[PDB]
Amino acid sequence: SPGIWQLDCTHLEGKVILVAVHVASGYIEAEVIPAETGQETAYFLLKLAGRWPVKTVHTDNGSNFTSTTVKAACWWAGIKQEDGIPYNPQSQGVIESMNKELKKIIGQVRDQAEHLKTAVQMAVFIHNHKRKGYSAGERIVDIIATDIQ
Amino acid sequence: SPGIWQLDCTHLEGKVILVAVHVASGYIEAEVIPAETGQETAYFLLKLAGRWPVKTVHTDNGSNFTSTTVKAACWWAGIKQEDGIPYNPQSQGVIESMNKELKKIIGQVRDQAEHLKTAVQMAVFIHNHKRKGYSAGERIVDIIATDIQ
Ligand SMILES: O=C1Cc2ccccc2/C1=C\c1ccc2c(c1C(=O)O)OCO2
Ligand SMILES: O=C1Cc2ccccc2/C1=C\c1ccc2c(c1C(=O)O)OCO2
Ligand SMILES: O=C1Cc2ccccc2/C1=C\c1ccc2c(c1C(=O)O)OCO2
Ligand SMILES: O=C1Cc2ccccc2/C1=C\c1ccc2c(c1C(=O)O)OCO2
């Protein structure tokens, strides 16, 4: 489980927000794209895996699970690509809650930037620094450092 | 020490690659932009500081040191913005070497993707995972984990 991430795609302002959550910590990275394609999802996973030791990804839907470009990036980066089926139903709920909480934060900051993408990165920052006690950013570093050592 | 990063801007294919290096580990994040502006540097620093606990940044040149947009982002994210002057000249030489090494990796992958931005993220991945013995990605997590405790 230190290597497990989940993809999640949510919509705001006619645009798509692609999120990766590190399931054990709650830590996230996110970006805005005009629409979810395999091309964009593949690039996002390549960025993530160069930054954190991503071993497994639960993909967000069957189009990205099937996408040959996503499978190419998962092969390149050494990621085991998995489906995203909430074989555990508390999964659907945790992700829904995250999207509602991210959108709330986005609305709390939205007036401080012109572009949605800036607001989304402000919300990533506030989410990862929030203590709840340790923050998600502290949790992920502690988890992965324990895994190394 | 655990919160110190250095900005570095290098050029390839008529484009600019903006790099942040975590000085104690060598770990990097990077992006391709059409040219270095305060706007893009500000956005890049907001992304970085949402993902790692960025306390101090040595800016790469005086235009980004002066930029009011850069200063806004550093204020928003809680980053101490510093000049980039190698009061220790070892610094310049280290950054030069990194740019040469990154360009070398980029050339090694360049034919595997159409777009430079993809090649640069492949190079970020190879650089962060290279063991030296620990990799930069391992060093950064160990340093920050040690700091949290
Ligand atoms: O062919 C491959 C192998 C590979 C391995 C890992 C990641 C990407 C690619 C990849 C292509 C590609 C994919 C998405 C992109 C993208 C490109 C590109 O060709 O630059 O550009 C932006 O989003
Ligand atoms: O260790 C990590 C990795 C990480 C990734 C993303 C965000 C924060 C962190 C982080 C630590 C942290 C450090 C100093 C702070 C701070 C926090 C925090 O609250 O997250 O809050 C104020 O000064
Ligand atoms: O005014 C502020 C306060 C602030 C605080 C933190 C980061 C950005 C901003 C910021 C503006 C901004 C800056 C760069 C951008 C950007 C925008 C934007 O307005 O969306 O869009 C992409 O690069
Ligand atoms: O702990 C971290 C944080 C980090 C950030 C970026 C890249 C790697 C790492 C990393 C660990 C790591 C884990 C498993 C590996 C591996 C490495 C590595 O070599 O970096 O190499 C192959 O299997």
CATH of the domain at A25: 3.30.420.10
What are the structure tokens assigned to A120, written together?
A: 């989304």
Nearest chain B residue to A31 by CA distance is B47
Q: In Å, what is the CA distance from A6 to each residue of A20, A56, B111, B133?
A: 6, 8, 30, 30
CB contact under 8 Å between B43 and A117, yes or no, is: yes
Contact B4, B149 (CB under 8 A): no
What are the structure tokens assigned to A137, written together?
A: 């950013």
B77 touches chain A (CB under 8 A): yes
Q: How many CA atoms lie within 13 A of A113 on its CB side?
A: 22
Closest Cα of chain B to A83: distance in Å?
A: 24
Number of independent structural domains in chain A:
1
Q: Report the structure determination method.
A: X-ray
- Residue-range definition of the domain harbouring residue B44: 1-149
Give exposure, A28-57, as e/b (b: 16+ Cβ within 10 Å).
bbbbbbeebbbebbbbbbbbbbbbbbbbeb
- Number of inter-chain CB pairs under 8 A, A vs B: 71
This PDB structure is determined at a resolution in Å of 1.7
B93 touches chain A (CB under 8 A): no
B110 contacts on A by Cβ (under 8 Å): none
Interface subset of A 54-73, CB within 8 angstroms of B: none
Rounded to the nearest angstrom, the gap between the alpha carbon of residue A10 and the centroid of all alpha carbons in its chain is 11
Rounded to the nearest angstrom, the gap between the alpha carbon of residue A82 and the centroid of all alpha carbons in its chain is 15
